[PDB]
Each structure stands twice: as structure tokens, then as C-alpha cells.
């Protein structure tokens, strides 16, 4: 799609393994690659591999950045959490991935820690510190928002 | 206090369901009986804070934010669990792995807010203060009345609560007027010692001086760490003594001095299960595996294929044979490196050093002693025994040391007469060295000797004298250059898994295949060679068995073989040619 | 301050101070001498004394070349043994 | 057991391990910091000789067997380091 | 005392005889009177005893036994403690 | 107390102060500032009463901004990315910033090139295996006073993000390398405190050996290691040292082989990427200028004023030069393009055919991979500058010469007589002792004869020519 | 008060154990009477017990 966001997403590494022998590397003199090596690709063409076939072209070894343990440690404190250093893409990105491999235990989970951080963004969203510093760029540009809303808010407020 | 009953059997509860701890448990209490029937493990049980959240939140936040209500219920519930176990024939301890963190926290960033809750230090420690007892449990034994007296004496560090000093001394005649002698060896002493933590020196933002804080290593926790140590300690954040308060005047501001107790201590910076062994045992049979290794140790260096090739057959060398009622001789292989600068001779011995598993590197002088115990009033390759030691500018170092390297690296012992303690101690160490050629550049074309510069003896002692030259040409060049582009855009690891079962198992001992060849061998060396080049001795011909019973270390052959010896052959050959 | 005096440095003040030989002076001086050139005061920090005295001196010197009479076509510095820097003041 | 030992000496020290408290201090540790030390019991030191033994007795019957077989000098001799060629 | 006082009544042993520069060399050499060492400096006017035996491995002048040379060129020694 | 007012002839009195709370960290040592806070006074036994005063803080301010700077994160305002993704698009960028760094000093233009790509940092690669190789290079401004290099390091020392000024031997009290000490109840040094950035270094002949070693283990593997008593820790320097060296009896050392310089062994510049040995040839308009500066030096304010209006128009205001390096420091990191690869490849055999030529007559003076990875290092740095992600031929094509100009400075009783030694050597001492530079200074004390650059020229001399 | 808990080892009988391991011996008359006597002449101090015999 068009915003530059979304686009973006779409540039992030995932460690996807081969289902099948492909010659024709575009990648490098293979020529051919074998069966089940393990190539990182972008998101955008790695999307429709998992689906067009009854065996997919590709596994979907999941990424480093959903490892249980950060799944785990996103369940403690996500408000200190620091996510614009693991990605920095969480939420552009993650919500294609839980589509992709259909994953509906994990919803339940970044359904909370987008509260979370919220009921925190609210808190800066009045009139920074280092907190800033470590959001996704996208919640990042929500905050831009609110914050302008709350500041021209504030300059109509008084002359 | 019926609240931490409450928390005991809320502890309970999250063991046995699920039970994955109390497997670990019952391995405790197991394996320590088969020490009894033999013919030393610490009795902590780690509990990963991953599993404490899918129960209850509750008591999670609590841990973190108010940890002495909590770890000890905990942890009286888990000794109350560990005597439900099997059967009679301590306090334990917590451990709390994480799933960090709140809490996270550096010892830059800290105090107050963080204090009297759980924390994760990390940085470096210096400078180890030195380890030493400290009572707990007093035991004594009244006559004739006997029975068995005890009192219970509690410390500053005593659980982690603050609770009204017992100590001091001993309670002697308690009544009635019975003597009370003091029993050593039934009452308990847990060890003691602390250890000061700087943040780490790189993530450090300006001139801004250093701040440490200081932590008690409770029990088994003693000695696991050296100073200089990357280490990310935990524990519960303490702040004990008074401010000065407590005295009527201490008039002065500075106060409360606080530390973190316990707790884990996971270091930062082998176990062949399985899959492994069976990995390495497939891999031992496919003839070409030597060449592979080989190059596996240098993704970033060039050719120097029969160095690299060196170097293995070092990691491997040559069993150890100690005659009987006579002396041993002289297993492991020791290299010389000589060559013009930018050779990688600096470059590749930290390689060496990484996965060496040990040793020690000591770079020109270096010393004092060296080697040696120095007999202090009132070293290195003693403490680097069964490894490598690495010497970098192996020609700077002062004839002073080389007359001991002598007596370390052939007869492979050291001997201190000093003043003094007088012994005869072992340092069977493995020895590498890289060293600048005499003046400037000019090894290239220099002579075979007046090139090495460091007489005469000791260029014998080293098994292997390797020559590389920095010498250049344009194609050569080109193939450089591309390589060194990629670089800035089978596993490794293995190689060092590969290689300890190795060293144990199994060591090939000696055949008559390989014998007659060798024997020619040397003599083609000595004879034509003597009119070549030199020096060429007896030296030269044990060098031949290390190097061929390595190689069979490499084939993993319970046997020397022919192969083997042609291959020894072959890098002496690129030695000397 | 022996068991306060000044070296000929402060004792000297706005006259004239006149040393012979420096190459023969041991460094302990040789600092003393290089910190009146260089700042006009001499400071003494011992024993619990501690000031700046002020010698304004004009310094004469006398100096013998090392060795012979004319030790070499090489420049002055490299004909005496006086570092270069001392010389420059 | 005193003077038994001599200092640069290696020695196997057994004995009984101790805490001799605290004579103070005791502000200080606090608690109570046994700080210890080893009781002396028995001394075996490694490496204790000819010319000196009495006997030549039934030692005798030891150097015999290597007497008997004769040309004791050469047997000796090649018995010093056969560990080499 | 060290070495020769320590190793007395037996033998002594000795490598690298060559390197061991000069006053090394002048114990050695009186040490073949035997029953002596001198000491006169400092706070030692001893005269302590010595019976040590001395064996000495020694490498001739480099790099090895020069046949075109004498015996006595491509030995270092000098004939005062060969004798 | 600040130095203007009112030190007299007196060292300036201190005040102790606690600040608390939410005023703890609030401000970097060696900022002025403007306490409020109470007054009051402590005891703290040290009579008779005598208590002894301190200032409680509430609350405290820095002076204007102070923010931002110090307290500078990684993060900005948008603007200056604005701004700064504007400065990319000027063509002269690089040719503006080399008129930035020395508004005073005259000249001198491929040192003040060289602070430009020494400043912006490199190439720098984590690539398995453990080996990680670096940036950026090195510095050196060897050569006579006049110079102006020991002043040039106090302006690196101004503009870079964090930088460290230590001449030494180290000064005063701070060592200069990694030091374990202990808490009696790291010690600090140049290095530790420095890291991450530039260190500034004088004297560099002048240090002590065993921290000597340190510095020369360090600035290759960029790693410290201390293995003293219960801490074997091996702890970090990303540091770049910048050294100007002192060079020995003026214009003859050049007249001497050009190595030889430092103690007796030329290996220090051999791990030195870039050296310059130099010449203030003031273009007849330099000593005028400094001269015509003495001679007024008072009223009325007009030159400081000059100055002033050349700092506004001296190109970047400096003040904005620094947000600009941490700013490209952090943002991108530069890659090289193929044909400037092999481009380079041709550079690097050429010179060591070439030179090599040179020195089959041993002509006295060298060529290291060390040198071409610096080359690498110079180019990615100048693609740093234009904040490229890629590199370009020309852009090398800079580099190439640049350095060349450091090869250039690579290669600028009578020697052969006392080089003898050797009658001495020969049918005086087979043996060498009781010889000794003793006896040489016998031999050659009333001889009316050796220097000790001569006694040890002669002897270096005759050691490397294998006399 | 300073309570008391029964352990399994008993000095008491130990001593009794002790006087029969003491002057009635075989093994090795018996080494404890001659040992002890010598010791009782005077022209002995040390008593070398070795547990080995116990």
C-alpha cells in the first residue's frame, strides 16, 4: 500500500526456510539452492510463499523477535519494555505475522501490552523524557497526534 | 503471622503443579546418595521467574517489589518440601532466573526507588574480597546432664528480614550452671564474602567518575567469579547499618550504606548430549574431514592452510607418554611464527586463544616470572597447565625469561629454589609464539639464519618453525581485495566440541605401519638437509610422533596409521621447505 | 622551609640572579629554575607553609658545551646538553 | 611438633580446623566472623638418604639380587636414564 | 643459600652452560677446590661449605663443533676450568 | 568559584553542597551553573567548636540551556534532522567543513582534511568470526613547534562529541591507560573515560612503557585486557587516538631516514594509519598575521570582534558541527562500491611493486595491509560525510591522494667511521662484555668523539646492517 | 531458652568404646600398653594415634 509505513514493514528480514529445491537463484552461483537451507527474506515476498503450493514453498521458521522469551518478557513490564531497539517495527509487522501463520494465542497478549503502553502515551500526551526514545515508530506517530491535538487544545485554551 | 503461612502454602500450590522443578529437586536429593555410595553440588533449586506469572500476578509483583515477605515463606516451603522428598539418608536456596526486567537496571541507574526491591546488576567486579568463614549455627555439649545444647546466632545478612542481633560470642553455662563446651564440626558454618560492581566502561557517558555498589555472595556463591569478570548479578537490593542515627551524635550527612545479598550470579559474555557425538562419529570416517577443520578456523584469514593445519595438530598433540620408573617424554607441539608485519601472526592467536579452551596469553614483557610462583613474601604457565599459551612478540621478551622457557617447554617442568619454598612444580603447557623478524622487513631474503634472531637452542625447542612472507604481487593482491570486501558485509562452535572429545577419547598409542616411514623420513632430513639448511636433531624425529599421533587424534583412530605419518611428513616438509 | 628561606630565585627579587654550570645541576633545581623563568613565582607547599613567592629575577647563566670546545657542526641544542624547551625561555 | 616445619618447605598438614574468636574489635564483625585457622596434628612432608642407614639387614638379600647375576657395573650402567638411546 | 649449598653432598646439575656469563663462572671455577664458597660482601663474611658435585651440559660455540676448528675454538671455555 | 571573579592572587575557596531528589544527576561536573539553595553548616569532627558550612540546594539551575548539551541522547528535535538533511545537499559540504575546523590556525590543509574524515568515525564490522575489525585510523602531527598541532587537539577536543585531552604520561592525577584499583572503604584513565569516540594524545614519545604496551595492544583490537589479582577482565575502547608527537634535533631527522624517530623502533608508526610530519610555511601573509596580531593585542576589541564575525561566517558555527558528527555517527553506516574496490587493489600493488623497486637499493625508511585498510577506512569515513550508504569512485579517488600525501611524509664525526665498533667488536671483544655502552663511551669519551644519537645510530646502525 | 535437640551419637558409650580400644588390643604384648608405658617411663611426650588402627 501507498503510506510508507506499511512499505517499510515489508522490508524487515525473517529467517524462512526453503520447502523445496529452487534453481534460478535470484540471490549466488548456486546454481539451484538445496532443500531446507535456511535464507533470510523480506516480509513482502516471503508473504504469499507460505501460502501458493498441497505443501508450501517455505516453513515459516518463526522470527527471533517473537521468541517465547520476549513474548514472555512483554508480559512482565512492557511500559520500561524498549521496543524501537528489537525491530524497531512491532506492531505494523506483527500484525501481519499473526495472520500469516494464524496464531491466536499471542492477540491475547499484544492486545495487552498496546493498553499498556497506552494508558502510559496518554500520560505523555500532557504538556517528554527519554520515554520517547523508545517507541515503535508508528505508536511513535500516534503520539505525534495526540500530543498536537492536546498542544493546539492548549494555545486555543488561552488567546 | 498467618500471612506467610499463607504465602507457604500458596508456594506450595505452584509446585507439584506443575512439577517441573521437583524433578530437580529429587535429582538434589538423589544425587548427592550416590555420592554416598560412591566407591559436592550445592543445594539451591533455580526458579525461572517465567513460570511464576501463568499462576498468579499477585504474588509475581510481590517478589519484585517487597522480596523479604516473600523469598523466605518461599523458601522455608521449599526446604518443607525437600524433607517430603526421599527420605533422611539446610536452609537451601532460591535462585530467580528472569524474564528481566523492571529492574533491568545498570549500577549507574539505581537508588532509591530501586532499593528493597529485587534488581539486576550488571558490570564489571572488582576487586574480590577475600573469602572467609562466618558462623551461623552454635552448638555446644553439656556433662554430665548432657543432652545437646544449641543457640542460633543471627546476622546482619541472617535470612534477609531484619530481625534483633543475636550475636556475640558463645552462651556458656546456660542454666542451670552446666558446663558448655563448644562443638566444632557439627555447628554450621555457611561461607561469606563480597564483591564490589562498576558499571560497564564502555556504555560509560562521559569523564563522569565511576559508581559502584557492592554485593555479599551468599554460600555456594563464594569464589565462582574473578575479578574483572562480566557478570550480571541479582539479588535483593539492601541497605544496612545506620545512618549514623542510631548514636546521639554521626553528625555528618553521609549515611546508609547500602549492598545487594544473594543471589545467582550468572556469568556473561562441554555438554555433547546426544545428538553431538554421534554428529562427530559420522563425521570421523569421510577421508577429506582434515582439510575442512583445516580451513574452518579461518574465515577471515587467507591460504596459510598448512599453518591453520598447524594449529589444530597443537590442540590436539601427541597423548602424553610417561615411561615407567623413568621419565615422560614430551606429548604436546609447540609453533614459531616469522614474518614481515600485517601476516596476521598478532591476528590469528587471539583465534587461537578463543577456542583453545584455555590458556593464558602473555604478549613480549609481560613477565614478572613469567611462569613461576614468584615465592611470595611474605604464574602464568603453571596456571595455564594442559592448554595453550599464546606469546606475542615472542623476540622482545628479555633472555632472562628464555633461560626458564628452556627448562618449561622440553623438560615440561618448572623448578623453584627461591628462598624459600623449594619445589619441582608441573607446567606441561602447550606454547605458541609469534615474533617480528630481526630488523625492518628484510626475513624475505635474508638468510636462514641472522633471520630468526633469537639463538639458538630455542629455535630447536619449538617443534615447528613457520616462515610467511608479506612479499606482493597483483593477483594475489586482487584475490585480497575481494575477500576483504565481503568481510564487512561446520559451525564454529562445533570445532571446539569436536575437539574435547578428542582429547580424551581416545588416544591412538603407536603402530608399525607408520614407523619405517618416519625413520626414512629423518634420516632423508638429517642427511640432505645438513648440506640444505638447519638445525636438524633428535628433537626433530619426536616431533615426527607428535605430529603424526595428532593426526590420528584428528582421524580418531584408536591406531597410528601410514596416512598420519606421510601428513607429518608434509608440514615439516613445509617447515623446512 | 629547613630546620622559611628562599632559593637565589626569591632572594634575588628584581635584581639579579646568576648561575653557573647549569648541565651539572641535578633536576631538583633544574624544575625550581624552569618554573621562575616560566611563571615569575616560586610556590612552596611545605611543610604546612604554603604561599607563592615572587622572584621576578633576570637570570645569568654559564654554560659549558659537552665534551670539546666546539662539540659539532650540529645547531646549538644538539652542541649542549640543555633540552631545547629550557633553552627556548 | 614444633620446629617440624621449615619454611619454603611443600608438607601434607593435617589436623583439626578452627576458629579462635574474636578477641576484639567486635563492633566491627558483626558476625561473628570466625576468620579460623589449622590446629597442627601430624606432619608429612614430601621429599625427606645415603650415606646413613645402620642395616645391612635383610637389605642385603635387596642388593643381592642385583649382586648375583654379576657384571653389576655394566647392568648399572645402562640402568642410568634407559629412558634415551 | 641456593643451588650449591642447597645440592651438596650430591650432585648438581647444570645447563645452558655457556649463557651463564661471568660471575657465575667464578663460583663454579673455586667450587672445584671444593669444600668452599666465599662470600665477602656486605653482611656475609661466610665461609660456607660446599660438597656439591657438578655436572654441566654445555653447546659449543655456534653453531655446532666447527671441524675446520680446533678443539679449544669451538669449545668457549677457557683451559683454567677445563683443567 | 568561577575563575573571573575574584581569584586575586588566591586560589578560589570551595563550598560543599548536597543536592536530593529530583536535582541528583541533574548536572555534569564542569558546567557553571546558579545554585539557590539554604546555607547552613555541619560538624563533622576533623575544635573548638568550629563547624564547618555547606549549601543545601533548592532547586538548582543550570546556565543557558544548558540542556540538549550537555545531556545530549540519541535522539533530536526534527528540525535538526531537517537542517542537517540540508547541509547533505550542498556540493562544497566537504570543501565547508574543511574551512570549519581551524578559523585560527593558517594553512596546514591536509591535517585539517584529516581531523574531517578522522572525526566521522568508519567502517565497522562485527562479521563472524569473533574478529571485529575498526575505525577510525589514526593521527599524527609530528613535527617542530609552530605547529600549532598541540593547540589543533584542543579544538578536536572542543568539536568532538567526546573527546578526552590528555598529554602524558597522563595528567594529573588520572592514568592514562585501564588501571585496577581498589576501594579502600577501574580506577579511570584516558581510554575508559574516553570511549566510544576521540582521545586526544601529546607527547606521544614521552609515555611510559607499561601502559605503552597497553596503548599499542589497545588500539588495534580496540580492547583493553587487565588480568591483575581476582579480575581477569577484558573491558573496552572504541577510542581513536589522535597523537602529536615530538620529534628529535629538527630538520636533520629528515636528513635521517624518516622511521627511526621514536625510541629505537618504528613499529609505533607502523600501527599510525596517517602521519604527518609538517611545515607552517606561512605564505608571507601567515607571520604577518601573527605578527600584526602581537603588535596591537588591546584596543579596541576590533580583532576579537574579526574573530567573532568569523565564527558566525566560519562556516558551521561548530557549536552545530558537533550535533552534526553524532548525528551521521549514529545514523548510517557506509559501505564500498566494486570498482572502487578494485580500484584500490590496483592502488595497493602499484605501491608495493613500485616501492619495492625503490627499496632494492635498501634505501633507508613502511608498506602494510594496515596502511590499505586505513585507506578503506579514510573512504568510508568521506562517504560518511555525505551521508551516502554507498561509496563512489571519485570519492575514493580523493582518498587515494590524500594519503599519498602521507606516503609522501613517509618518505623524507661521521656515521660510516664510528659506525665501526667493529674493530672494537672484533680483536677487542669477541664476547661483547665488560664492553658494553660503557666501554664504547671509554673508547669513544677521549677520543674527542660520541654523541648519544651517534653512539646509538652507529649501533643501530651496524645491529640492522648485521655487522 | 537456648532448647536442645537429640542427636544419634552418644560420647558416653564412645568413651566406654574408647577405654576397650585402649590396653585390650590383639593386632599389633599389645602397642597401647607398651606405647603408653614408655610414655609413663618418661623418656617419651608424644602420643601418636593413628586411626588406621581405630
Known amino acids: 500500500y501507498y503510506d510508507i509505513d506499511d512499505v517499510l514493514a515489508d522490508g524487515t528480514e525473517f529467517p524462512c526456510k526453503f520447502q523445496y529445491d529452487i534453481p534460478g537463484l535470484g540471490y549466488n552461483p548456486g546454481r539451484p539452492i538445496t532443500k531446507n537451507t535456511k535464507l533470510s527474506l523480506p516480509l513482502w515476498l516471503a508473504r504469499i510463499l507460505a501460502i501458493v503450493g498441497p505443501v508450501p514453498f517455505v516453513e515459516l521458521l518463526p522470527p527471533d523477535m517473537f521468541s517465547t522469551k520476549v513474548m514472555n518478557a512483554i508480559k512482565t513490564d512492557p511500559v520500561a519494555l524498549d521496543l524501537h531497539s528489537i525491530n524497531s517495527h512491532f506492531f505494523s509487522l506483527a500484525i501481519k505475522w499473526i495472520m500469516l501463520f494464524s496464531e491466536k494465542e499471542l492477540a491475547n497478549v499484544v492486545s495487552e501490552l498496546l493498553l499498556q503502553r497506552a494508558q502510559e502515551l496518554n500520560h505523555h500526551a500532557s504538556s517528554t523524557s527519554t520515554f520517547l526514545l523508545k517507541l515503535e515508530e508508528m505508536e511513535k506517530e500516534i503520539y505525534k497526534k495526540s500530543h498536537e491535538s492536546y498542544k493546539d487544545t492548549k494555545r486555543w485554551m488561552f488567546k | 503471622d498467618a500471612v506467610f503461612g499463607d504465602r507457604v502454602r500458596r508456594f506450595q500450590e505452584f509446585l507439584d503443579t506443575f512439577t517441573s522443578y521437583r524433578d530437580s529437586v529429587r535429582s538434589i536429593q538423589v544425587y548427592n546418595s550416590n555420592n554416598a555410595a560412591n566407591y559436592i553440588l550445592p543445594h539451591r533449586i533455580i526458579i525461572s521467574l517465567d513460570d511464576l506469572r501463568e499462576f498468579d500476578r499477585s504474588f509475581w509483583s510481590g517478589i519484585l517489589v517487597e522480596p523479604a515477605y516473600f523469598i523466605p515463606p518461599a523458601e522455608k516451603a521449599l526446604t518443607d518440601l525437600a524433607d517430603s522428598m526421599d527420605d533422611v539418608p539446610h536452609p537451601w536456596k532460591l535462585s530467580f532466573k528472569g524474564s528481566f526486567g523492571a529492574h533491568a537496571l545498570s549500577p549507574r541507574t539505581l537508588t532509591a526507588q530501586h532499593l528493597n526491591k529485587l534488581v539486576s546488576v550488571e558490570g564489571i567486579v572488582t576487586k574480590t574480597s577475600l573469602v572467609r568463614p562466618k558462623l551461623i549455627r552454635s552448638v555446644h555439649y553439656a556433662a554430665k546432664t548432657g543432652r545437646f545444647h544449641y543457640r542460633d546466632y543471627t546476622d546482619a545478612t541472617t535470612t534477609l528480614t531484619t530481625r534483633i542481633p543475636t550475636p556475640a560470642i558463645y552462651p556458656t553455662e546456660d542454666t542451670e550452671g552446666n558446663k558448655l563446651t563448644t562443638e566444632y564440626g557439627y555447628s554450621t558454618f555457611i561461607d561469606h564474602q563480597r564483591i564490589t560492581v562498576q558499571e560497564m566502561p564502555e556504555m560509560a557517558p562521559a569523564g563522569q567518575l565511576p559508581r559502584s555498589i557492592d554485593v555479599i555472595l551468599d554460600d555456594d556463591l563464594v569464589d565462582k567469579t574473578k575479578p574483572g569478570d562480566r557478570v550480571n548479578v541479582v539479588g535483593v537490593f539492601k541497605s544496612l547499618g545506620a545512618g549514623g542515627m542510631n548514636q546521639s551524635n554521626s553528625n555528618t550527612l553521609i549515611g546508609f550504606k547500602t549492598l545487594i545479598l544473594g543471589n545467582t550470579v550468572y556469568p556473561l559474555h562441554q555438554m555433547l548430549t546426544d545428538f553431538d557425538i554421534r554428529n562427530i562419529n559420522k563425521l570421523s570416517k569421510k577421508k577429506d574431514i582434515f582439510d575442512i577443520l583445516s580451513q574452518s578456523l579461518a574465515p577471515s584469514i587467507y591460504g596459510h592452510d598448512h599453518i591453520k593445519k598447524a594449529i589444530l595438530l597443537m590442540l590436539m598433540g601427541g597423548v602424553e607418554k610417561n615411561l615407567e620408573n623413568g621419565s615422560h617424554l614430551r606429548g604436546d607441539i609447540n609453533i614459531l611464527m616469522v614474518g614481515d608485519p600485517s601476516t596476521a601472526k598478532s591476528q590469528l592467536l587471539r583465534f587461537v586463544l578463543n577456542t583453545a579452551s584455555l590458556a593464558i596469553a602473555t604478549t613480549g614483557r609481560g613477565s614478572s616470572g613469567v611462569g613461576l610462583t614468584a615465592a611470595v613474601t611474605t604464574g602464568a604457565m603453571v596456571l595455564a597447565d594442559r592448554g595453550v599459551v599464546c606469546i606475542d612478540e615472542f623476540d622482545k621478551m628479555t633472555d632472562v625469561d628464555r633461560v626458564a622457557i628452556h627448562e618449561v617447554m622440553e623438560q615440561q617442568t618448572v623448578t623453584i629454589a627461591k628462598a624459600g619454598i623449594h619445589t619441582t612444580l608441573n607446567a606441561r603447557c602447550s606454547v605458541i609464539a609469534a615474533a617480528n623478524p630481526v630488523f625492518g622487513q628484510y626475513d624475505v631474503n635474508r638468510d636462514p639464519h641472522q633471520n630468526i634472531a633469537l639463538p639458538d637452542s630455542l629455535l630447536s625447542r619449538f617443534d615447528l618453525l613457520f616462515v610467511v612472507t608479506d612479499d606482493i604481487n597483483e593477483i594475489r593482491d586482487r584475490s585480497i581485495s575481494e575477500h576483504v570486501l565481503r568481510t564487512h558485509r561446520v559451525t564454529i562452535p562445533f570445532l571446539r566440541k569436536y575437539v574435547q572429545y578428542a582429547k580424551e577419547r581416545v588416544i591412538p598409542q603407536l603402530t608399525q605401519e607408520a614407523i619405517n616411514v618416519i625413520v626414512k623420513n629423518y634420516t632423508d632430513l638429517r642427511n640432505d638437509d645438513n648440506t640444505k639448511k638447519s638445525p636438524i636433531t633428535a628433537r626433530t624425529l619426536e616431533t615426527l610422533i607428535r605430529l603424526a599421533t595428532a593426526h590420528a587424534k584428528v582421524r580418531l583412530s584408536k591406531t597410528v596409521n601410514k596416512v598420519d605419518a606421510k601428513v607429518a611428513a608434509n608440514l615439516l616438509r613445509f617447515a623446512l621447505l | 622551609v629547613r630546620k622559611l628561606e628562599g632559593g637565589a630565585l626569591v632572594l634575588a627579587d628584581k635584581g639579579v640572579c646568576l648561575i653557573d654550570e647549569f648541565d651539572k645541576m641535578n633536576d631538583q633545581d633544574r624544575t625550581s629554575i624552569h618554573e621562575a623563568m616560566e611563571q615569575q613565582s616560586i610556590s612552596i607547599s611545605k611543610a604546612g607553609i604554603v604561599t607563592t613567592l615572587q622572584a621576578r629575577c633576570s637570570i645569568i647563566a654559564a654554560a659549558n658545551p659537552n665534551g670539546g670546545r666546539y662539540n659539532s657542526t650540529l645547531p646549538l641544542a644538539q652542541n649542549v646538553s640543555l633540552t631545547e624547551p629550557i633553552l627556548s625561555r | 611438633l614444633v620446629r617440624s616445619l621449615s619454611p619454603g618447605d611443600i608438607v601434607d598438614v593435617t589436623g583439626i580446623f578452627l576458629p579462635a574468636p574474636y578477641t576484639g574489635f567486635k563492633a566491627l564483625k558483626a558476625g561473628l566472623l570466625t576468620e579460623t585457622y589449622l590446629e597442627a596434628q601430624f606432619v608429612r612432608q614430601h621429599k625427606k638418604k645415603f650415606a646413613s642407614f645402620s642395616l645391612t639387614s635383610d637389605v642385603e638379600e635387596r642388593v643381592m639380587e642385583l649382586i648375583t647375576s654379576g657384571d653389576v657395573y655394566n647392568r648399572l650402567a645402562k640402568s642410568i636414564a634407559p629412558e634415551i638411546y | 643459600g641456593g643451588a650449591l649449598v642447597l645440592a651438596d653432598n650430591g650432585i648438581c646439575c647444570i645447563d645452558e652452560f655457556d649463557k651463564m656469563d661471568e660471575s657465575d663462572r667464578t663460583a663454579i671455577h673455586e667450587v672445584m677446590e671444593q669444600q668452599t664458597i666465599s662470600i665477602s660482601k656486605a653482611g656475609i663474611n661466610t665461609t660456607l661449605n660446599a660438597r656439591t658435585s657438578i655436572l654441566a651440559a654445555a653447546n659449543p660455540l655456534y653453531g655446532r663443533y666447527n671441524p675446520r676448528l680446533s678443539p679449544l675454538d669451538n669449545i668457549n671455555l677457557p683451559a683454567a676450568l677445563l683443567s | 568559584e568561577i575563575p573571573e571573579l575574584v581569584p586575586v592572587g588566591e586560589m578560589p575557596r570551595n563550598l560543599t553542597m548536597t543536592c536530593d531528589r529530583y536535582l541528583t544527576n541533574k548536572v555534569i561536573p564542569g558546567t557553571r551553573v546558579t545554585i539557590v539553595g539554604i546555607y547552613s553548616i555541619y560538624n563533622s569532627k576533623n575544635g573548638v567548636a568550629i563547624r564547618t558550612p555547606y549549601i543545601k540546594i533548592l532547586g538548582i539551575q543550570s546556565d543557558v540551556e544548558t540542556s540538549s548539551i550537555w545531556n545530549s541522547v540519541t535522539m533530536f528535535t526534527e528540525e535538526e534532522e531537517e537542517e542537517f538533511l540540508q547541509l547533505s545537499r550542498n556540493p562544497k559540504l566537504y570543501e565547508i567543513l574543511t574551512n570549519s575546523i581551524a578559523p585560527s590556525i593558517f594553512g596546514n590543509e591536509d591535517i585539517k582534511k584529516a581531523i574531517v574524515c578522522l572525526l566521522m568515525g568508519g567502517s565497522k564490522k562485527i562479521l563472524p568470526d569473533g574478529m571485529r575489525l575498526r575505525g577510525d585510523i589514526n593521527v599524527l602531527l609530528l613535527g617542530d613547534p609552530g605547529t600549532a598541532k598541540s593547540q589543533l587537539l584542543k579544538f578536536v577536543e572542543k568539536v568532538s562529541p567526546i573527546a578526552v585531552y590528555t598529554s602524558g604520561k597522563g595528567s594529573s592525577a588520572a592514568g592514562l591507560t585501564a588501571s585496577v584499583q581498589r576501594d579502600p572503604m577501574l580506577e579511570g584513565g584516558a581510554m575508559v573515560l574516553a570511549d566510544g569516540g576521540v582521545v586526544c594524545i601529546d607527547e606521544f614519545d614521552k609515555m611510559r612503557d607499561e601502559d605503552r604496551v597497553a596503548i599499542h595492544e589497545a588500539m588495534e583490537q580496540q580492547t583493553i585486557s587487565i588480568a591483575k589479582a581476582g579480575i581477569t577482565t577484558v573491558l573496552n575502547s572504541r577510542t581513536s587516538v589522535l597523537a602529536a608527537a615530538n620529534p628529535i634535533y629538527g630538520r636533520y631527522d629528515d636528513l635521517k631516514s624518516p622511521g627511526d624517530n621514536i625510541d629505537f623502533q618504528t613499529t609505533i608508526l607502523s600501527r599510525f594509519d596517517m602521519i604527518f610530519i609538517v611545515k607552517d610555511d606561512h605564505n608571507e601573509e601567515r607571520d604577518i598575521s601573527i605578527a600584526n596580531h602581537v603588535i596591537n593585542i588591546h584596543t579596541g576589541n576590533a580583532n ?113 667511521e664510528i659506525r665501526r665498533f667493529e674493530q672494537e667488536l672484533k680483536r677487542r671483544l669477541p664476547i661483547g662484555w665488560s664492553t658494553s655502552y660503557q666501554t664504547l663511551r671509554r673508547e669513544f669519551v677521549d677520543t674527542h668523539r660520541f654523541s648519544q644519537l651517534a653512539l646509538d645510530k652507529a649501533l643501530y646502525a651496524l645491529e640492522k646492517h648485521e655487522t | 531458652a537456648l532448647p536442645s535437640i537429640q542427636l544419634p551419637v552418644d560420647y558416653n558409650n564412645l568413651f566406654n568404646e574408647i577405654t576397650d580400644f585402649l590396653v585390650t588390643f590383639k593386632q599389633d604384648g599389645p602397642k597401647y600398653m607398651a606405647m603408653l608405658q614408655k610414655v609413663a617411663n618418661r623418656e617419651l611426650n608424644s602420643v601418636i594415634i593413628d586411626l588406621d588402627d581405630i
Open chain 6, 304 to 416: 576579537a570582534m574579526q574573530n567573532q564575525q568569523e565564527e558566525n561566517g566560519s562556516e558551521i558555527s561548530i557549536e552545530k558541527m558537533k550535533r552534526y558528527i553524532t548525528y551521521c555517527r549514529l545514523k548510517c553506516a557506509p559501505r564500498l562500491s566494486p570498482q572502487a574496490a578494485e580500484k584500490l587493489s590496483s592502488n595497493f600493488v602499484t605501491i608495493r611493486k613500485q616501492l619495492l623497486i625503490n627499496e632494492l637499493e635498501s634505501t633507508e625508511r613502511p608498506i602494510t595491509i594496515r596502511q590499505l585498510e586505513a585507506i578503506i577506512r579514510i573512504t568510508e569515513s568521506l562517504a560518511k560525510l555525505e551521508l551516502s550508504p554507498i561509496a563512489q569512485e571519485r570519492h575514493v579517488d580523493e582518498a587515494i591522494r590524500l594519503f599519498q600525501a602521507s606516503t609522501m611524509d613517509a618518505a623524507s664525526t661521521s656515521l660510516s
